[PDB]
Amino acid sequence: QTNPYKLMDEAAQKTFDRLKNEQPQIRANPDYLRTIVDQELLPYVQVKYAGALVLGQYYKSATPAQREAYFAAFREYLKQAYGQALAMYHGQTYQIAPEQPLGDKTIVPIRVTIIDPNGRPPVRLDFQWRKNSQTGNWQAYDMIAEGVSMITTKQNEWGTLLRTKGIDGLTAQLKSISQQ
Amino acid sequence: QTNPYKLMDEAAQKTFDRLKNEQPQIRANPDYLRTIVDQELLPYVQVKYAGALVLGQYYKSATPAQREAYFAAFREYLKQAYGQALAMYHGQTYQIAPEQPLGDKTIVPIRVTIIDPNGRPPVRLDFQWRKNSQTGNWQAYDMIAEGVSMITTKQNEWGTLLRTKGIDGLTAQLKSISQQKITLE
Amino acid sequence: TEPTYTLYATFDNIGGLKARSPVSIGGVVVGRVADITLDPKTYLPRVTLEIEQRYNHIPDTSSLSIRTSGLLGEQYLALNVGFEDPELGTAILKDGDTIQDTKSAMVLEDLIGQFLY
Amino acid sequence: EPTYTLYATFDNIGGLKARSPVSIGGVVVGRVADITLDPKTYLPRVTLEIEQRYNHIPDTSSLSIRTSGLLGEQYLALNVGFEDPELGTAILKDGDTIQDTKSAMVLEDLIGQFLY
Amino acid sequence: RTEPTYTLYATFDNIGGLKARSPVSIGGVVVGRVADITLDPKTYLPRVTLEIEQRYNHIPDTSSLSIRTSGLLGEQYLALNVGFEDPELGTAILKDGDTIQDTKSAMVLEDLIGQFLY
Amino acid sequence: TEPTYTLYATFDNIGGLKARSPVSIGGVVVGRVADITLDPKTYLPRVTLEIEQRYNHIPDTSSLSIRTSGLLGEQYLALNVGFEDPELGTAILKDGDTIQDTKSAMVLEDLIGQFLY
Amino acid sequence: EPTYTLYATFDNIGGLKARSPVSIGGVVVGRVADITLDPKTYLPRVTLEIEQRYNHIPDTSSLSIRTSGLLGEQYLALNVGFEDPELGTAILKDGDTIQDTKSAMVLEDLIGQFLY
Amino acid sequence: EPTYTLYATFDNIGGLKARSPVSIGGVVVGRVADITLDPKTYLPRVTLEIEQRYNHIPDTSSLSIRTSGLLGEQYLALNVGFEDPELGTAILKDGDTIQDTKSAMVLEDLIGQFLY
Secondary structure (H helix, E strand, C coil): CCHHHHHHHHHHHHHHHHHHCHHHHHHCCCCCCCHHHHHHHHHCCCCCHHHHHHHHCCCCCCCCCHHHHHHHHHHHHHHHHHHHHHHHCCCCCEECCCCCCCCCCCCEECCEEECCCCCCEEEEEEEEEEEECCCCCCCEEECCCEEECCCCHHHHHHHHHHHHHCHHHHHHHHHHHHHC | CCCHHHHHHHHHHHCCCCHHHHHHCCCCCCCCCCHHHHHHHHECCCCHHHHHHHHHCCCCCCCCHHHHHHHHHHHHHHHHCCHHHHHHHCCEEEEEECCCCCCCEEEECCCCCCCCCCCCCCCCCCEEEEEECCCCCCEECCCCCECCCCCCHHHHHHHHHHHHHHHHHHHHHHHHHHHHCCCCC | CCCEEEEEEEEECCCCCCCCCCCEECEEEEEEEEEEEEEECCCCCCCCCCCEECCCCCCCCCCEEECCCCCCCCCEEECCCCCCECCCCECCCCCCCCCCCCCCCCCCCCCHHHCCC | CCCCEEECCCCCCCCCCCCEEEEEEEEEEEEEEEEEECCCCCCEEEEEEEEECCCCCCCCCCCCEEECCCCCCCCCEEECCCCCCCCCCCCCCCCCCCCCCCCCCHHHCCCHHHHC | CCEEEEECCCCCCCCCCCCCCEEEEEECCCEEEEEEEEEECCCCCEEEEEEEEECCCCCCCCCCCCEECCCCCHHHHHHEEEECCCCCCCCCCCCCCCCCCCCEEEEECCCCHHHHCC | CCCCCEEEEECCCCCCCCCCCCCCCEEEECCCEEEEEECCCCCCEEEEEEECCCCCCCCCCCCEEECCCCCCCCCCEEEECCCCCCCCCCCCCCCCCCCCCCCCCCCCCHHHHHCHH | CCEEEEEEEEECCCCCCCCCCCCCCCCCCEEEEEECCCCCCCEEEEEEECCCCCCEEEEECEEEEEEECCCCCCEEEEEECCCCCCCCEEEEECEEEECCCCCCCCHHHHHHHHHC | CEEEEEEEEEECCCCCCCCEEECCCCEEEEEEEEEECCCCCCCEEEEEEEECCCCCCCCCEEEEEEECCCCCCEEEEEEECCCCCCCHHHHHHCCCCCCCCCCCHHHHHHHHHHCC
């Protein structure tokens, strides 16, 4: 890995193509895209920052095996929700932002866009790529859409619930959400 | 006969009756439903005031042939386009207003209500009865619902269209809307 | 000039229609209500209105209604002109008669709780 | 200006202040007197004054709270029901309390109900 | 405003909330003011007479009027719409003393609820 | 006025509930709010309030809440008294105790993201 | 009182007038110092200040912009961070700068995307 | 203080008055000069002023009209694009004209679009 734009472009085009060509197989069964999502896209993202940001505060007090089971169920929740969100295909093309070199940075935002003429005007998705402090391996974690986040709400809603019921309470809750 | 209350009661009775066993029949052809609508509803409605009220001031100048054609088109139109909310048939009881005698004037409002638990509160449908001046046989024409009317809107919308395109234009539009479509019943 | 008709009309609910407010026909002002009072026989309001003289050929079976302008204005009465035809219904509104048919007023809170429930 | 008094027990008064007009039909025929709290079960109690000139109403009336025009203060709305020919009816005397009731409405409850 | 101005006539059916003296603007720039409104003692319908500045004077006849609200609580102003003009074909020009064709109507928060699902 | 007696409460987001406001019950006002502050230990807000001397009987299973006034006004604490029941819940609010349950505030620009997106 | 200042970039001010209060969990700590523009990439830059008593917020916190009421004023709200052993830690010392941020929003985009 | 001038022809101006601010990003950099009709095709033309301290900007920017807050005035939002290495770019030399349009929005169109 080196220039994050390379990884972004290549992974995006490969994912779009792998979606498009195997779409008849998706029409064969709707309980199947999750394995492809976890096979191609997941190896490129990061996990620890997601749980680390959503948890917050309650980390000086922590139980090892409890953290293990939490990090476990977290990825099942995430994959299920993201695969459920995937189900919006109809056919539309993509475009990337104009390249701009820099280098001496760690946190760097980029943009993408998708468009379809016959139906509705385009939208504006984003991402958040982060340079690692250990080996320079760039990596992403967040996602933003027209001024709304996807981590801020999960940090703002699941509040007192943790403060009272218990970490294992949230673990059992997630384990329940693992099936929808 | 004389008291419109008895007419309203018998109308509610005969409407609630026989229409009940239509559950296998409603999913079939929703065409003969017009006939059942014609059965009891039509023989107590006055198309004449409906027409003479919607047509507006453009009546000091009119020809008999087009007049009769418009009246017939309006007859068939109101026949079709009345009865479509009947698809809401799921069962709900009816109740009448407390009786109060008078019988000295001509125009009289009444009331009615329908009750159905487990899904929204009841509504407040009304009517408007009028004592005829040719004999006294009361009859209805209007319909009201929570403030909104159902004949004022037609008097207020179809405006300049008549003023410009011509009465025959409205006749053509009504001919179009006569077989415009069939409800999803 | 003030050559006036005066007429009487009943209702059953009259929102916030205070006295001395204007009545309009088509979109122009042609006078104002004269007085408002109550009945000691059945507990229902009565309204006495007054009209100019130039307009004086209104057909009988007209109609009258209540409505509000803008969003935070003041309510007013809207008139509606009827029709003429022999045999069925005639009668020019002579001084001292009463407008017949009417419609009820609109209140809020009711429908906002009705739908979207 | 002779009048007389009545008592009512509500459930949650809402933003209704003290001293505000009553309304039958669409006119004004009284004014509310005082409001306090029951020191035995913690429910509000309200005293109302109406004109004696009207004195033939039945005993099965309701009572409710309304709003003015979008953003206007409140006023007690009343209603008149059916009176049977002297069977289960009578006349509100001078200390007989009304029975049925209906509360007010608050904002956040409706919003929270529309979602979740 | 000593500059001469030529007048026209228009007929509506429900002015809703107009008033004497208001600007009739085109595109978004003010031009002229409205002169007089009155009713017709013959079939009961309203009618308006308006002024137009003389510098602008080449309007094709196929045009239109409209009524419009301002802001969300502001009042009303007439709004003109200049239309198409085809060469060769007869279309003429608004010389003084004519009356333009089509129009629209006002809009008051009552008919909307009525047309809302009946 | 007459003496008072005070209590403590925690929260999570107090929106715009500033100092000095009524702690109404059912619909009548019965006291003000004393002091708000933050906890320099785990970063959470805390509030100390006072209640009049006259009412001296509240079952513990109660709750507080925050709500808006009208559609654009002030904000007032709203109390909710549960019920009394012998043998089971007997804790009488004496002095120097903290109500257990609580709720949060409500700010516009979070709803838009919560749903309708 | 001994204050200390920090620097942060953005993307859209969105009507955030200079000199306004920050907020951390509902309470007001400090105000914003000033705003300016960049002469190399055309982006705004904002310097802010903070009181010294609170002094342990871990680095990876967050900032955000929002509006109170329904149409009153608008301010910016902080979000306390997650404490990290082993990995990146770093107590914020004077003369540093906060990292990842977020951008404001305008209603017109939502109104347009809601009606297709 | 030194400035310079530019010309723009729109399509529908909306309630925009005169002498209103022209803002890039979130700060104020220009003020509008004058508005007049085109006595050849009847379309509006507007002259705008930009403070010359800023210079190195591309010649493919975009311009649009924006509303303020909820019920505030209006102003002119700008948008700066990218810049290729002197390939179809150049600098806005005193006296050129931007080449894009974006009219405002009025109420009745939305209602008619939503109710047909």
